[PDB]
Amino acid sequence: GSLTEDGLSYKEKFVVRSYEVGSNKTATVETIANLLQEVGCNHAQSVGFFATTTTMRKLHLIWVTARMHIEIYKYPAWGDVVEIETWCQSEGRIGTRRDWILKDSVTGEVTGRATSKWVMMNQDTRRLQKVSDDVRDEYLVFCPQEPRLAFPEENNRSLKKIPKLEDPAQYSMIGLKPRRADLDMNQHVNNVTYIGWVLESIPQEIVDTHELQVITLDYRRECQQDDVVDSLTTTTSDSQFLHLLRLSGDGQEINRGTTLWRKK
Amino acid sequence: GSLTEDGLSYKEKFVVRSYEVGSNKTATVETIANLLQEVGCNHAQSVGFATTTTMRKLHLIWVTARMHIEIYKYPAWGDVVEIETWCQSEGRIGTRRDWILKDSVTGEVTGRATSKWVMMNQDTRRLQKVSDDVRDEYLVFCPQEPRLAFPEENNRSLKKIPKLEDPAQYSMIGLKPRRADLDMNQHVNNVTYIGWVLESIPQEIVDTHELQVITLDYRRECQQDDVVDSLTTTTSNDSQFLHLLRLSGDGQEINRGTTLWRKK
Ligand SMILES: NC(=O)c1cccc(Cl)c1
Ligand SMILES: NC(=O)c1cccc(Cl)c1
Structure with missing residues (x-):
């Protein structure tokens, strides 16, 4: 894998394994989610990084997932090469967002996309908090400044409110x-x-x-x-x-x- | 991955992933076992396959009877491990698939594994010795002289295992x-x-x-x-x-x- 030319996103290729596929002989959504997590970890390692900044480690603060949204158009077949591009963006004091684009390596077509919201939490007390000025300054240099969204469409599925299932469940x-x-x-x-x-x-x-x-x-x-x-x-x-x-x-x-x- | 020069064994390199490691930040034995299975599948694909022509006709499959794995060093997250695999016929009893794991940087053997496979009818679940016709079809893909991952005289791979008696600890x-x-x-x-x-x-x-x-x-x-x-x-x-x-x-x-x- 590698950071792109501008150093603001990361790309990695993966060959789909025999144990990673379901009964359709294509990658399960859990294999996809594991790969998204892996390309996210390699991105943080490639830029100097839990993947926490200098101030976060000092304050015992971590990034935790609040929401994951994944849309798959075509699941890659066993033996296929899938390329994933990932990047981060600051959402002010609320926290950060990590986005992904999945592509078929042979055709270059987009076969999937994902977006995730992350919040800052004290790892000992489990108390959430807005992102500090000093913490933000440390990671802003690794994010694109103009918006770059995997889900740009206004009023799309990634930001819809989810209700609580009422008993009895079906x-x-x-x-x-x-x-x-x-x-x-x-x-x-x-x-x-x-x-x-x-x-x-x-x-x-x-x-x-x-x-x-x-x-x-x-x-x-x-x-x-x-x-x-x-x-x-x-x-x-x-x-x-x-x-x-x-x-x-x-x-x-x-x-x-x-x-x-x-x-x- | 690729078949070696003589076409009688297969080698593949794997980079250890973030989700594949345990608390020691090295690969779990289940990650190792998944990789052994993956290199076994790529070997069969590279030579024309995981059943022969006669096996599919008779509804016969290969099933694992025993798995034996010995790890000297678990590869760290981000390390490159190289695995070499090969098959050997054990007469009418069945076949054996063996593996050697190596650190790509040092070339040192970090692990080894051996497995016994028997022929079974897919539908009735009844075992059977390997017929000559089936044997003739896969023998051209196996080394003829013995090649054992566990050559030792009274090694751990062939020891009889007793039945645990109640109460368990x-x-x-x-x-x-x-x-x-x-x-x-x-x-x-x-x-x-x-x-x-x-x-x-x-x-x-x-x-x-x-x-x-x-x-x-x-x-x-x-x-x-x-x-x-x-x-x-x-x-x-x-x-x-x-x-x-x-x-x-x-x-x-x-x-x-x-x-x-x-x-x-
Ligand atoms: N783990 C982080 O703080 C972070 C923030 C933005 C980009 C990246 Cl690669 C990592
Ligand atoms: N699947 C098989 O029958 C088999 C037997 C020997 C070697 C290989 Cl690569 C495969």
């Missing part, structure tokens, strides 16, 4: 627990695991006859290593679904989301 | 596969069983030791709607364990294995 998958492969190097549950858990409550018949086109996921709270999750889904309609992940016992919300599926 | 109850655990054929990936074995190892061992050796027997599959119990008993500065995976209800065995851990 479908459910209960007792989901993370295993050691679900944890990252910091012993926290990988953000991609939550996408898998959302997808667990989609009926098999939808998975078999439809392809996932859009997934928007809000992150409210973490699932700890010893927590148990219930995944809930209700059809709101192409097929559209409303999703809710909550802790198995008290019913404490961890995530909410929506999916849009297209008939094959 | 440790256990992890109610493990269930999710859609990311399935391969393109909708069967549970062989690497998931390694993860489930490791689930019953106490955290203190994972935190202070490194896994050196894992030997795993495969007896029966876990189906998409099955629930598994992972059982471990210490059999021993090195720690050794006896492992058993069984179906949560009737206690039907699916796997048995052993692990050897060395203090960090």
Whole structure:
């Protein structure tokens, strides 16, 4: 992988692996999400970087995902080369946004796009906060100054408010627990695991006859290593679904989301 | 990746990804096992394939009976690991796939693995010896003189594994596969069983030791709607364990294995 000519974005090529594909012999949305995370990590490493600035480490501040939005037009087949370009943009004091463009390496056509919102949090107390002047100054030199959006369209799917699923849910998958492969190097549950858990409550018949086109996921709270999750889904309609992940016992919300599926 | 000069083995280089590492910032044994499977798939594709012409006609497949992996050094995040793989016929019993892992920079062997595969009818699940017609079709892709990753006289790769007796010292109850655990054929990936074995190892061992050796027997599959119990008993500065995976209800065995851990 490499930073582009202007040093304001990063590109990387990936060959889709045999274990990364589903029953359609194309990459799962979880493989795509893992690759987006990997190209995001290589971008931070290439520019001097958890990927925190000098002041953030001193104050015990980290970047945490508030929302992930992914739209796939074509899932790459096993053996195909996919190229991903990623960049960051400051959204003032609210936080930052990381965006991605996925392309077929052979045709150069855009096969997908993603956008994510990140907020600053104290890693010990878990308290959110606006981004400081000094912290902003440290990372602004790595972001394009004019807006560059993967989802430019006014009133698009990436910024829509998501409601809370009401009981009873139409479908459910209960007792989901993370295993050691679900944890990252910091012993926290990988953000991609939550996408898998959302997808667990989609009926098999939808998975078999439809392809996932859009997934928007809000992150409210973490699932700890010893927590148990219930995944809930209700059809709101192409097929559209409303999703809710909550802790198995008290019913404490961890995530909410929506999916849009297209008939094959 | 590429077949070597003589066309009897295959080599591939892999850069270790951010999500592929554990708490030590080096590749998990499940990442290693996934890579072994990937280089095995690319080898079969490069030589014309994962069944021969006669196998497809008779509805016969290759299934893993045993996997044995020994790691001397786990590659760090960002490191390049090179893996060489080859197959050998073991007469009518079946075949063996072997692997050598090396650090690309030093050329030092950092790991090795060996696996035994048997022929099974896809539909009835009945095993069978390898016929001459099938043998003739794949023998041209194997070295004729023996080439063993584990040449040693009384090495760990061929030791008989006993059945863990109740009560187990440790256990992890109610493990269930999710859609990311399935391969393109909708069967549970062989690497998931390694993860489930490791689930019953106490955290203190994972935190202070490194896994050196894992030997795993495969007896029966876990189906998409099955629930598994992972059982471990210490059999021993090195720690050794006896492992058993069984179906949560009737206690039907699916796997048995052993692990050897060395203090960090
Ligand atoms: N991790 C960061 O602070 C950050 C901010 C902007 C661009 C990049 Cl590459 C990284
Ligand atoms: N899949 C096979 O039958 C096989 C047998 C020997 C070598 C290789 Cl590369 C493949």
